[PDB]
Design a protein around this ligand. Structure first.
Ligand SMILES: O=c1ccn([C@H]2C[C@H](F)[C@@H](COP(=O)(O)OP(=O)(O)O)O2)c(=O)[nH]1
Lengths: 150, 150, 150, 150, 150, 150
């Protein structure tokens, strides 16, 4: 189904570096539809719930602090296999090991300052989208370019 | 002062044509700070109160019908002389008469489908910003790149 | 009417400099439809007919000699006010005096090597299109993006 | 030898999405020479002869029907190892699995709407070129930039 | 003559903002040849000799101070009418009044942080070139692309 | 450490092809700092020292004769893991086998005309930096964008 959605979030460093439009453009060019978009300064309760799976890890504390250190541009894109395509486009955890052409591969140098977040699966996508967006904030009537899908 | 703000809105045709990120990128490159950003399908009352100055004009009906025909990406940029600079970058009412280099000049061909809206003065900017954004949605602590301002 | 057409031609120097795709992309982003496209090495008869209005000027000789010195990418774009918009986008006769943003303004430095040709009026557009293109080579059913025209 | 040629074709979806110039630009930047270029609406005979190898497969029908559904920009590029490089730049059959940086990787989302066609070998290139282009439409004297070849 | 040269200098703000490559690329696309290039932290004596004309002006102190506050990428471009073309491409003194498409028009917002310096005339170019560059640092054998000049 | 440095050099072909600005921009976008920059026409001994390891190889003759055949834009970038990241961005020895997204992958076609040089290790970087740059020509103080490093 082409009604698959994922959660993307340009982090404080990506926003502070003027990468918001560049990132949105990459997804628009690919053919994914922006189902939701907004800028906010994450709160602790949200950063913590968002990174729940790492609550046990050492870095968790630093993850929750930086994400709430400034504005974030949260967004939702819809399309066929968007969760895996979104991540392929982002690159890998370490921006230095990310191939040229990917977001992190082109603009990132540190793992702590890795510009953007992308859901790693449909299960997490759905959880994260419900965490950052209210239903009233997501488009229902989507309908994509007919030159994209058969 | 560099704490001046303006209201920009990528209209249904700009959004539907995948111009959102391209437009945001132009403002970020310039040095202006994104103080608010969100996507929504305008409601008739908002379309009408926004286009108030034209309620007596023939085309008003089509303005309100179109802007509410699909999602709009509303946004607020802050910076020195941003209202006038924003409009200079947008181009003129008729995209066919807009010089290359400007948004409408590069992507527009019809006056009714002219991609974006920009406040025409600080008085209107202030009015519109309050019409589309709630105070909680606008960043307070702005702070731009020190290499932009003396 | 939006069924207006103009004749553009990337000249030997524009082609030899790898500017073909860059120029086509500029027009496509604008909203104009490619109704005809082909690469060929102009014959004297066609060069002369094309530059008829300059047959009595000193430079005519050099014009006819150069346009036939290599391959030319002839093309026809359709859209509202395309003839004047195409020219506005090209720039002026002398690339050095052409504004940044325009084709000649960005890539040209000499008037003899001014990269591209564009019809100067609908009258000449129609004459030139018939000179370079056979009716069978031009699209009849054009129909552009609905987000371009009201 | 650097006189190797390949057949590329931006399909109806690539054309209708305004990607013609973008794709041509990528090949010109690389250093390949455009030996033939033209736009046309393929006929059934040409669509079928082209996809001959697939005549017995299920999808054939949809392949022929789509490629003839609208205008195609056929083109031939010449250069060292152009057939393999052209394919490397196109990406893989499934645009979702295509790496960022490649044509399909950047703009494609469905395999039925995968933007461009490229010959898979020198044997097929030679066949297809003769299928789409008449000898008079192809450049004889090519000669590429001396800063490209040793 | 096409052996005209001009002196451009990306100031500390332009360099600190990652604009060096972007600026060099605009000039290379145009067709001008890079006759000299280097990065350095200007010394007072040089900054002062450079801005000699403004020695009596109020802002003089601030000019010499800023230009020496960080690295500058000094460069010399050669080409027909390069002194006037360079400035046309830079924009005007106040970046907010500079038209989209120009360097200052696209990236600058403050007159004190106006990104780049360009000679204002052939007399000044020759003076500044000799101030920043030693003869051994400038190319003798220039020879530009033949597709540029007639 | 983030004080790692590598030596990059746009060779005569990259320079002659107007690729200098394009290449530097890729590194600046990434987040690496330009610690040294200059254009020169390599002298025979510099070329030879530089390519010591290839001395006994059949092609050392043309390697030296080429690097010294025209101007080279030598430069030093600083940042975390810059030597390995720089290489990854350049692509592989044969540009035809280099992935789209990489410098060689996007612009190169021949191995003898492979646009750019990058150090292959920290040991070589340090050797080459000292070979091409005098200590006075390199910056001491770095100050990397704080949104790059944690
Ligand atoms: O057969 C050959 C192989 C490489 N080369 C040149 C290109 C390059 F600058 C130099 C060093 O090659 P190598 O170290 O293998 O590749 P790279 O590190 O990518 O430059 O050899 C040739 O001229 N001929």
């Amino acid at each position: 189904v082409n009604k698959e959605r994922t959660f993307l979030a340009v982090k404080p460093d990506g926003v502070a570096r003027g990468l918001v439009g560049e990132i949105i453009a990459r997804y628009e060019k690919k053919g994914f539809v922006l189902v939701g978009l907004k800028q906010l300064v994450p709160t602790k309760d949200l950063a913590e719930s968002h990174y729940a799976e790492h609550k046990e890890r050492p870095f968790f504390g630093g993850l929750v602090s930086f994400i709430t250190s400034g504005p974030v541009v949260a967004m939702v894109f819809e399309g066929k296999g968007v969760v895996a395509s979104a991540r392929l486009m982002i690159g890998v955890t370490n921006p230095l090991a990310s191939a040229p052409g990917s977001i992190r591969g082109d603009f990132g140098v540190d793992v702590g300052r890795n510009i953007i977040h992308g859901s790693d699966s449909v299960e997490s996508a759905n959880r994260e989208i419900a965490l950052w967006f209210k239903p009233e904030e997501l488009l229902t009537e989507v309908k994509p370019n007919p030159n994209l899908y058969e």
